[PDB]
Structure formats: C-alpha cells, structure tokens
C-alpha cells in the first residue's frame with residue numbers, strides 16, 4: 001500500500017520500507033518519489049551549493065540499501081556523461097529544471113558519442129536511469145535559476161565512469177560528498 005509521502009522524512013521512512021527486501025520495484029519507487037511535493041524548508045539543510053560545480057549532499061544511507069542525496073546545481077553547472085555502476089538511479093527535481101541527455105554505450109572503436117535524445121526535467125518530476133537503458137549527462141542550463149535534485153541509487157556506489165564525448169573513452173571517477181547529514185565534509 002503506497003501512500004503519499006507527507007514530508008521528506010516521511011518519504012525516507014517509506015523508502016526504507018520499499019528497500020526492506022533484496023529487489024527493487026522501480027515503478028513503485030518512482031511513483032512515491034514523484035508523489036512527494038518538494039518542500040524547500042524540509043531540505044534546506046542539505047542544499048549546500050559550491051560556486052564552481054554541482055555538489056552532492058548525502059541525506060540518508062538507506063540502512064545500506066541505497067544512497068539518498070541532494071545535488072545542488074549552480075547556474076550552468078552540469079555533469080559528465082556517466083554510467084551508474086550497475087545500480088538503479090532515480091532523479092527527482094526539487095527546484096528548477098535540468099536537461100537530461102541520453103547516450104548509448106560506446107563501441108570499442110573511438111568515435112564521437114552522439115546523443116540519442118534529450119529532455120527537460122521539471123520541478124517535482126522523477127526520472128529513472130540504469131546502465132541497461134544507457135548513459136546520460138545532467139545539466140542545469142539556466143542562467144538565472146539554481147537547481148536542486150534528489151537522487152536515489154541502489155545499491156549505493158562510490159565510483160562510476162565519465163565518458164569523453166569525442167571518443168567514448170571512459171575513466172573511473174570517485175564520487176565525493178560535499179556534506180553528509182547536513183555537515184560539511186571536506
């Protein structure tokens with residue numbers, strides 16, 4: 001029985017129920033994330049921006065089943081083209097808009113990675129990606145509005161690959177947290 005999360009804390013409690021077992025009902029997780037109506041006062045603690053690039057702010061560790069984090073995207077900040085390390089990845093907009101560009105996995109031959117599609121993710125919409133679907137880039141293309149998104153990854157992962165758009169070549173990158181549970185973590 002999926003109920004509407006009344007608050008961020010209620011959402012977290014519901015997520016612990018949805019991840020109590022060993023598998024993931026993607027459609028139910030996405031539905032509950034979509035149904036949470038972003039309330040800025042509930043997540044202000046985690047919305048810690050950096051001037052130069054987007055930040056990752058850990059909210060909950062899901063009793064080991066998932067990482068739940070808030071990403072804070074300054075104007076013009078964006079990600080690499082990246083994978084998700086054999087994990088489910090849900091992305092819900094809490095504030096602003098983000099452009100998501102999808103790419104196929106590269107072949108062995110060095111070639112330009114050509115986007116397969118793009119879409120604008122708007123406030124409160126929850127999207128989903130996994131390595132079977134493909135790779136993506138996420139960007140705040142706004143000149144005037146910072147964006148904030150809520151991301152859930154299951155299982156949690158500390159590393160992933162960035163792909164060079166000119167060649168498809170990949171490099172391993174380690175995820176760094178700007179803060180954890182509201183506390184800045186150098």
Ligand SMILES: [Fe+3]
Nearest residue numbers: 082089136138
């Ligand atoms: Fe991603």
